[PDB]
């Protein structure tokens, strides 16, 4: 007559496999070079423009009215975030207690948590040379993103830096699913109404995470505190990312921000 924490961990993992279009196994199969619709490599302007014509044709169907390359890239980044936000919102229903919260608290938790979760999961599609994009159908190089004009070259590099260290922890999907659930369940988000119930939701999911890591990673006795630190690092990465997005908003008139993301950023930090 106790909670079955192993079963809860499996429920979380299954919800993550169902709700996210990309997972670490799927990404690694693509990244390894394994036969139908392999990713198109974007390493320079020529290959960016070829990939766009095949994979996002509408965005470049405007002739002389097409936006600048960097702005098109930023638009594609935002489309990816909007999709991942939708996936995270459905995933969160699997977290014990989340769907029992008031709707406004669900919204606040997702508002602060989504970009932390986005950058954690992005590590799964990154290696030291580049990252998968467009539902696994493109691979854009880290050097190409660094070559973009300021401020757009400053978007991805800190995320690659985070990812290389995160990937060295050698987490699998069963671990990452619980880490993402724990990110969402933070009782210290600004503006929460029912802090007490959220704190107990957080305690429960972090307990599931700690026990799972103990079992799944017997070789790394500090993995749990390492991941607690990664959550704090992600909060700082998101604060800095939001500051850069605000610079883009103020100084780049063509880089329209999608309304869902503007709402996430509004009053965030
Ligand atoms: C063929 C063109 C398609 C894709 C290549 C262009 C851009 C890369 C796409 C996605 C990159 C992945 C994640 C985006 C990272 C940070 C989010 C920045 C925008 C935001 O603040 O929501």
UniProtKB/Swiss-Prot annotation:
The keyword Mitochondrion does not apply. Ubiquitinated by E3 ubiquitin-protein ligase HUWE1; leading to proteasomal degradation. Phosphorylated. Changing residue 234 to R: Abolishes heterodimerization with RXRA, DNA binding and transactivation activity. The keyword Transcription applies. Keywords: Activator, Biological rhythms, DNA-binding, Lipid-binding, Metal-binding, Nucleus, Receptor, Transcription, Transcription regulation, Ubl conjugation, Zinc, Zinc-finger. Residues 105-234 are annotated as: Required for heterodimerization with RXRA. Residues 40-267 form the NR LBD domain. One of its GO terms (biological process) is epidermis development. One of its GO terms (cellular component) is nucleus. Indeglitazar binds at residues 81, 115, 265. Skeletal muscle, liver, heart and kidney. Expressed in monocytes. It is found in: Nucleus. The record marks 234 as: Essential for heterodimerization with RXRA. It comes from the Eukaryota. One of its GO terms (molecular function) is NFAT protein binding. Its main location: nucleus. Induction: Down-regulated by aging. Heterodimer; with RXRA. This heterodimerization is required for DNA binding and transactivation activity. Interacts with NCOA3 coactivator. Interacts with CITED2; the interaction stimulates its transcriptional activity. Also interacts with PPARBP in vitro. Interacts with AKAP13, LPIN1, PRDM16 and coactivator NCOA6. Interacts with ASXL1 and ASXL2. Interacts with PER2. Interacts with SIRT1; the interaction seems to be modulated by NAD(+) levels. Interacts with CRY1 and CRY2. Belongs to the nuclear hormone receptor family. NR1 subfamily. Ligand-activated transcription factor. Key regulator of lipid metabolism. Activated by the endogenous ligand 1-palmitoyl-2-oleoyl-sn-glycerol-3-phosphocholine (16:0/18:1-GPC). Activated by oleylethanolamide, a naturally occurring lipid that regulates satiety. Receptor for peroxisome proliferators such as hypolipidemic drugs and fatty acids. Regulates the peroxisomal beta-oxidation pathway of fatty acids. Functions as a transcription activator for the ACOX1 and P450 genes. Transactivation activity requires heterodimerization with RXRA and is antagonized by NR2C2. This is Peroxisome proliferator-activated receptor alpha. It comes from Homo sapiens (Human). The lineage of its organism: Eukaryota, Metazoa, Chordata, Craniata, Vertebrata. The chain holds residues 200 to 468 of 468 of the full protein.
């Amino acid at each position: 007559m106790t909670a079955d924490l192993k079963s809860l961990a499996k429920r979380i993992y299954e919800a993550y496999l169902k709700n996210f279009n990309m997972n670490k196994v799927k990404a690694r199969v693509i990244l390894s070079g394994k036969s139908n619709n392999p990713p198109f490599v974007i390493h320079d302007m020529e290959t960016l423009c070829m990939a766009e014509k095949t994979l996002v044709a509408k965005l470049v169907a405007n002739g002389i009215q097409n936006k600048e390359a960097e702005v098109r890239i930023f638009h594609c980044c935002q489309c990816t975030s909007v999709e991942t936000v939708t996936e995270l919102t459905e995933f969160a229903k699997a977290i014990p207690g989340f769907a029992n919260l008031d709707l406004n608290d669900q919204v606040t938790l997702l508002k602060y948590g989504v970009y932390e979760a986005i950058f954690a999961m992005l590590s799964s599609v990154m290696n030291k040379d580049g990252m998968l994009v467009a539902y696994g159908n493109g691979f854009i190089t880290r050097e190409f993103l660094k070559s973009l004009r300021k401020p757009f070259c400053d978007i991805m590099e800190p995320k690659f830096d985070f990812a290389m260290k995160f990937n060295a922890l050698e987490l699998d999907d069963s671990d990452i699913s619980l880490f993402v659930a724990a990110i969402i369940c933070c009782g210290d988000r600004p503006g929460l109404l029912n802090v007490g119930h959220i704190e107990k939701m957080q305690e429960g999911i972090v307990h599931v995470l700690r026990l799972h890591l103990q079992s799944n990673h017997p070789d790394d006795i500090f993995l749990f505190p390492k991941l607690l630190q990664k959550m704090a690092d992600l909060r700082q990465l998101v604060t800095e990312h939001a500051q850069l997005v605000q610079i883009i908003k103020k100084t780049e008139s063509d880089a329209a921000l999608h309304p869902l993301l503007q709402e996430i950023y509004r009053d965030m930090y």
